[PDB]
Amino acid sequence: ELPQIEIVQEGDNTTFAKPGDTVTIHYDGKLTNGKEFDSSRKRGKPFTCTVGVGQVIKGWDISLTNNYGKGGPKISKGTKAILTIPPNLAYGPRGIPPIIGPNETLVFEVELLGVN
Amino acid sequence: TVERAVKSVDPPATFKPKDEQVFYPNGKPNHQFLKQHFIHEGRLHEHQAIQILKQATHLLSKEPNLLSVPAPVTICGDVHGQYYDLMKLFEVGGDPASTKYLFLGDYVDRGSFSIECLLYLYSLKINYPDTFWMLRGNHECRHLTEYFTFKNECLHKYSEELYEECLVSFNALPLAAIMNEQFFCVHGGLSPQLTSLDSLRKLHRFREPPTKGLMCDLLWADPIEEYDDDNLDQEYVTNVVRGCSFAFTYKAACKFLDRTKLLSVIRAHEAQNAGYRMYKRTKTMGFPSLLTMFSAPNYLDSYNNKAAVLKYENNVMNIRQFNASPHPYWLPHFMDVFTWSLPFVGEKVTDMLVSILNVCT
Amino acid sequence: IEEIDRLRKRFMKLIDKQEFLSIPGISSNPLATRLMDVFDKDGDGSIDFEEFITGLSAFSDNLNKLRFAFNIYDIDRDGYIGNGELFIVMKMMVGKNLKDEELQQIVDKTLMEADLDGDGKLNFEEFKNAVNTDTIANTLT
Ligand SMILES: C=CC[C@@H]1/C=C(\C)C[C@H](C)C[C@H](OC)[C@H]2O[C@@](O)(C(=O)C(=O)N3CCCC[C@H]3C(=O)O[C@H](/C(C)=C/[C@@H]3CC[C@@H](O)[C@H](OC)C3)[C@H](C)[C@@H](O)CC1=O)[C@H](C)C[C@@H]2OC
Ligand SMILES: [Ca+2]
Ligand SMILES: [Ca+2]
Ligand SMILES: [Ca+2]
Ligand SMILES: [Fe+3]
Ligand SMILES: [Zn+2]
């Protein structure tokens, strides 16, 4: 099981995130019906994390590190993308209430602003 | 530990003012109190807020579908619960004690202070019913408030009963206005079914907006993107962007204005970097055929757009712009910090409790 | 009783605050110190074998699970969650994702929603009313 990645605009094609790197991202998250559940851009602080270590949902690790080198679409710095993430790679049947319901598929519109 | 770690931050006002503060002795809401109280994120007792909803519904339900608004008047576009920009708007537009107002709808959704915007605007309406007017926008209905933020807001801050009472007040909002016998004012725009002004006068409006038809179009219509180019012969085209209703052309506006003997159409509904936008001028009299107002600066905390209101008098359109003002922070979905952090607490603690457990084969 | 002897050999292979972070993964955990303190019931800086078993034993009725979640926020062990305590513990998990003004404002509004008696802090009763009693006990296992 993998997440679906659709490249909206591309970046440098050179700077790809690898496991253990940090990234900086502006994301809007919404459900398949379009209802938005969060946006970093509205909060004014870009999200920063360490990818590939399980410090985020599995869909983000797989998307940002190219499934740790075993694809089946890479994301470079400056790429604006859309990640469609199935519930098993997100918040499963439990969900994060009240912000994410059960068995929900998540669609993140991410812009990779920086790596390291 | 018991003191506040960030003392430069003002704390919220009380969630329970006394009746004698929220209402004047005559029983009308004390809008000067509510203005300051909402600036400091105070809340009302639910029964007080329902009382304000019920008095506004009573006044609104007696007004006609199509208001008559005399000049001079300040006309305002969308607010979307941006209460701290609404404070600035009144500074720019004039004191409601001596300034006529016409709002074009979209009071709620997206900003985290929709119920403050709505209760405050209604308390002005109640105290100034002959000089203060509010149209319905497309967000003042059940479908959109369910889909966006306003229902989650009422349920968090108050209850579903209050949410239902707001819906009753939305269904009572007038649809449009003739301003100074010169302008058609509406939230969205024109309609293929807007044959005469009577078509609008005959509507039964106390309802959720229909999927299609006149009432939907007034709330949902846009001009076509190429409106100024004036290169379409049709009047109306399917509004794919909105996914309902129509986009209308320069030709539709001009034929409508000629029919109804009006100068221009003033509407809102679309964000404007400059706060307003004047479209192609009328071949009949030279006024703008269309004007879009938008009163929500730095829309959604990300657009960095200016806002504008329209101060109309002496056949003059004084456009007054303003920038965004700071506002307090709310988590998405109005979560408290326990709802927000407890899933992560459990993950982080458990992880340690499993490492401690797995130390032995 | 077989499991009670099982924790003795886990504990023996493992407690000081320096010894505690040695456990794999605890070094990078933002709640490492908060978890240490809650298990450290007498506030002497190390975890007893009695505190080890007792604190684990809540992961019993659902009441011990609610009590533990409360104690993660109640730093000084005084039985109330103070405004500043809530800010400090949230700051351990929120990182640079909120500005301090933003964090303080939603700390303020949380307590004003959950503070029934008016004192400005949260006793255990007000905490239990403000959270999902079920979601909490289910997470702990
Ligand atoms: C002190 C507060 C807690 C702490 C909160 C922050 C640092 C603020 C940070 C910007 C989160 C946002 O808060 C505004 C908000 O972001 C969302 O809206 C969102 O877009 C999202 O899905 N993101 C965030 C961006 C990366 C992917 C994903 C995520 O991996 O998020 C991670 C996540 C929730 C993992 C869960 C943890 C619980 C487990 O049970 C579950 O296991 C399956 C996995 C986040 C980073 C956690 O590591 C950290 C926290 O939770 C969530 C829908 C809900 C989440 O608020 C909680
Ligand atoms: Ca001890
Ligand atoms: Ca305390
Ligand atoms: Ca209390
Ligand atoms: Fe709008
Ligand atoms: Zn609109």
Residue numbers in the entry:
A (entry chain C): 4 to 75, 79 to 122
B (entry chain A): 62 to 422
C (entry chain B): 19 to 32, 40 to 84, 88 to 169
Please quote the paper that reports this structure:
Calcineurin (CN) is a Ca2+/calmodulin (CaM)-dependent, serine, threonine-specific protein phosphatase that controls T-cell activation and is critical for numerous cellular functions. The CN complex is composed of a catalytic (CnA) and regulatory (CnB) subunit that binds Ca2+, and is activated by Ca2+–CaM2. Here we report the crystal structures of fungal CN ternary complexes with FKBP12-FK506 from highly clinically relevant human fungal pathogens: A. fumigatus, C. albicans, C. neoformans, and Coccidioides immitis, reflecting the common invasive fungal pathogens, including a mold, yeasts, and a dimorphic endemic fungus. Each complex has three components: (1) the CnA subunit with catalytic domain and the BBH, (2) the CnB subunit, with four EF hands bound to Ca2+ and wrapping around the BBH, and (3) FKBP12 bound to FK506, interfacing with CnA/CnB.
Crystal structures of CN–FK506-FKBP12 ternary complexes from four fungi were determined by molecular replacement to resolutions between 1.85 and 3.30 Å. A flexible hinge in CnA separates the catalytic domain from the BBH, which forms the composite surface for FKBP12-FK506-complex binding. While the CnA and CnB interacting residues within 5–8 Å of FK506 in human and fungi are conserved, fungal FKBP12s differed in 4 of the 17 interacting residues, as well as other residues surrounding the 40s and 80s loops.
